[PDB]
């Protein structure tokens, strides 16, 4: 093992939720014990994975949208399409989230991981900012994320990504990273209500029947990807101003100073619990099958 240890960042909320959507049936209350068991089982599996690959420092990166998103404070329509979807569902989202927040606080109090959890901050924020930090500090980095796109981090040395769901390595140095990032910035990212620079910013949220997004030439995307100064040249003023907006929504380098510094400061001041707390936590929570496996956490 290295003097600057290998660090594992886990895209954890998405892993737990994906597992929960398989394990927990529709039309049944999702309770604290159910969620605690699932979260701890998932941690056990993915920590073993990190440790065998040679990464010893475990950081659990959490999605916390209890009060929304910092990006939404900037662009109100951001990710509003997602909440719309859950409103309908007969799956117990309310119970899941309520219980997950409780378990996360238990992790903070008792388990030996850095739990990056800040209301209105996304797992991808923690990962992007900590990768920049750790990479410059000379740590090898492993991202555990089933479907996350981290190709924006292609410039950082010694960053690998493992996907638990697909059981395979994921490309970080994709060869088309900048063009793929710029495609989202210019053409939008509908899955997150991010709109093309050729329409009003809240297009996806306020779309009226019949409305269409004007097409944009791939060559403009490629041109601006290769030299961003060309944005002032190939885009109209209105499109350029929308471009500036979308940079904040998509590009990791445009995470605001206060947001990024809050992430770093949270990491630095983190109160790591002594490993002695693991056993007493398992006993307290009645996880009697796990008091046997303390060494696997
Ligand atoms: Na902790």
The span from the CA of 279 to the CA of 274, in Å, is 11
Please give the distance, rounded to the nearest whole angstrom, from the Cα atom of residue 116 to the centre of ligand 1: 9
The span from the CA of 13 to the CA of 38, in Å, is 12
CB 6 within 8 A of CB 142: yes
The span from the CA of 72 to the CA of 78, in Å, is 5
C-alpha separations of 163 from 12, 38, 142, 272 in Å: 12, 18, 11, 27
CB 128 within 8 A of CB 58: no
Minimal CA–CA distance to 97: which of 132, 55, 66, 138?
Answer: 66
> What are the φ and ψ backbone dihedral angles of 138, each rounded to 5 degrees?
85, 25
The span from the CA of 237 to the CA of 233, in Å, is 9
The span from the CA of 169 to the CA of 154, in Å, is 14
Please give the distance, rounded to the nearest whole angstrom, from the Cα atom of residue 91 to the centre of ligand 1: 29
Please give the distance, rounded to the nearest whole angstrom, from the Cα atom of residue 138 to the centre of ligand 1: 24
Minimal CA–CA distance to 177: which of 145, 196, 147, 155?
Answer: 155
Where would I find the beta strands (DSSP E) of the chain?
A: 7-11, 57-61, 114-116, 141-144, 159-163, 168-170
Q: Tell me the sheet residues that pair with 61.
A: 11, 116
Q: Which two tokens stand for residue 240?
A: 């350029």
Alpha-helical (H) ranges within 157-256 are 177-187, 203-206, 218-226, 231-234, 237-250
The span from the CA of 81 to the CA of 113, in Å, is 32
CB 60 within 8 A of CB 116: yes
CB 93 within 8 A of CB 82: no
CB 1 within 8 A of CB 56: yes
The span from the CA of 130 to the CA of 149, in Å, is 16
Domains in the chain, start-ordered, CATH in brackets?
1-175+252-296 (3.40.50.1010), 176-251 (1.10.150.20)
Put the strands of the sheet holding 114-116 in their side by side order: 114-116, 57-61, 7-11, 141-144, 159-163, 168-170
Please give the distance, rounded to the nearest whole angstrom, from the Cα atom of residue 267 to the centre of ligand 1: 11
The span from the CA of 270 to the CA of 247, in Å, is 30
CB 180 within 8 A of CB 66: no
Q: How many CA atoms lie within 13 A of 249 on its CB side?
A: 31
Burial class (CB within 10 angstroms; exposed 0-12, middle 13-18, buried 19+) of 179: middle
Number of Cβ within 10 Å of residue 7's Cβ equals: 23
Question: Which residue in this structure is represented by tokens 């709109």?
Answer: 195
Please give the distance, rounded to the nearest whole angstrom, from the Cα atom of residue 82 to the centre of ligand 1: 29
- Concatenated DSSP letters for 223-242? HHHH-GGGHHHHS-HHHHHH
> What are the φ and ψ backbone dihedral angles of 42, each rounded to 5 degrees?
-70, -40
> What are the φ and ψ backbone dihedral angles of 3, each rounded to 5 degrees?
-60, -45
Please give the distance, rounded to the nearest whole angstrom, from the Cα atom of residue 142 to the centre of ligand 1: 19
Please give the distance, rounded to the nearest whole angstrom, from the Cα atom of residue 81 to the centre of ligand 1: 32
The span from the CA of 3 to the CA of 5, in Å, is 6
The span from the CA of 188 to the CA of 148, in Å, is 17
Question: Which residue in this structure is represented by tokens 């380098």?
Answer: 253
User: Given CA atoms 38, 106, 161, 82 in this order, what sign does their dihedral have?
Assistant: positive
Phi-psi map region of 269: left, alpha, beta (phi>0 left; psi -120 to 50 alpha): alpha
Number of Cβ within 10 Å of residue 68's Cβ equals: 16
With residues binned 3-state (H G I as helix, E B as strand, rest as coil), the percentages for the chain, rounded to 5, are 55, 10, 35
Minimal CA–CA distance to 201: which of 243, 252, 230, 251?
Answer: 243
Largest CA distance in the chain: 65
Phi-psi map region of 246: left, alpha, beta (phi>0 left; psi -120 to 50 alpha): alpha
Please give the distance, rounded to the nearest whole angstrom, from the Cα atom of residue 274 to the centre of ligand 1: 9
């Amino acid at each position: 093992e290295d003097y600057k240890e290998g660090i594992c960042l886990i895209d954890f909320s998405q892993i737990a939720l994906s597992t929960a959507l398989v394990n927990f049936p529709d039309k049944e209350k999702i309770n604290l014990s159910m969620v605690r068991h699932l979260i701890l089982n998932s941690i056990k599996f993915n920590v073993k994975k990190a440790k065998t690959l040679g990464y010893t420092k475990i950081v659990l990166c959490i999605d916390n949208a209890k009060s929304g998103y910092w990006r939404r404070d900037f662009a109100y329509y951001y990710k509003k399409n997602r909440g719309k979807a859950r409103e309908e569902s007969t799956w117990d989202w309310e119970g899941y989230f309520e219980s997950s927040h409780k378990v996360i606080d238990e992790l903070k109090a008792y388990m030996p991981y850095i739990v990056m959890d800040i209301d209105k901050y996304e797992a991808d924020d923690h990962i992007a900012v900590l990768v920049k930090k750790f990479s410059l500090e000379g740590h090898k980095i492993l991202i555990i994320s089933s479907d996350g796109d981290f190709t924006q981090l292609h410039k950082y040395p010694n960053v690998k990504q493992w996907s638990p769901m697909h059981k395979k390595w994921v490309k970080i140095k994709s060869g088309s990273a900048e063009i793929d990032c710029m495609t989202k910035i210019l053409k939008g990212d509908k899955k997150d209500n991010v709109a093309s620079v050729k329409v009003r910013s809240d297009f996806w949220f306020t779309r009226v029947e019949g409305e269409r997004t004007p097409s944009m030439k791939t060559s403009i995307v490629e041109a601006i990807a290769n030299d961003r100064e060309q944005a002032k040249v190939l885009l109209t003023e209105s499109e350029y101003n929308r471009y500036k907006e979308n940079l904040v929504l998509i590009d990791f380098d445009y995470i605001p100073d206060n947001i990024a510094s809050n992430i770093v400061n949270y990491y630095n001041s983190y109160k790591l619990p002594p490993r002695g707390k693991i056993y007493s936590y398992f006993v307290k929570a009645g996880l009697s099958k796990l008091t046997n496996s303390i060494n696997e956490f």
